[PDB]
Amino acid sequence: IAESLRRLKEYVKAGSVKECVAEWCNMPSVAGFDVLSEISYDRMLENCSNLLLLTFIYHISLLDSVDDDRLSKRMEYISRICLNIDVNDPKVETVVHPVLTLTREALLRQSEFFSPIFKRRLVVLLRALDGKISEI
């Protein structure tokens, strides 16, 4: 964890966005997520491949923290990426359906422990994920 945090911190400073996301996905710690969270989702969309973006939301869905502020960031990243992602990109055709399915299931598995604010926010997020699965 500690070696990885050091790399993440330096990638954020340099503005190495893809590198930040890829580093965190390889070592998806809570502390690392908090460093990465300095990078807004729009920068991620400009710099990361669709495969990497799907790797990222999958890892966010598994992260074992339900703290309100952290969960807010978790859900915002997932929402924005899933609304932006082109589910018809051939490069992700063999992963996009199972990844969206696993992402939804992962969030539901944690949902009993979400505060009421985020139980309600999840209903909205699930609708967005289901809409993307509906396209394909």
Residue numbers in the entry: 935 to 1070
The paper states:
Previously, it was shown that the C-terminal 290 residues of Pdc1 interact with Dcp2.10 To probe if this interaction is direct, we performed NMR chemical shift titration experiments with the 15N labeled Pdc1 Ge-1C domain and an unlabeled Dcp1:Dcp2 decapping complex (Dcp2 residues 1–95). We observe that resonance signals from residues that are located in the C-terminal helices of the Pdc1 Ge-1C domain are significantly perturbed. This result indicates that Pdc1 exploits a surface at the far C-terminus of the protein to directly contact the Dcp1:Dcp2 decapping complex.
To obtain insights into the redundancy of P-body formation, we turned to the Pdc1 protein that was recently implicated in P-body integrity in S. pombe. Pdc1 can thus interact with Edc3 through a number of HLMs at its far N-terminal region and with the decapping complex through the Ge-1c domain at its far C-terminal region.
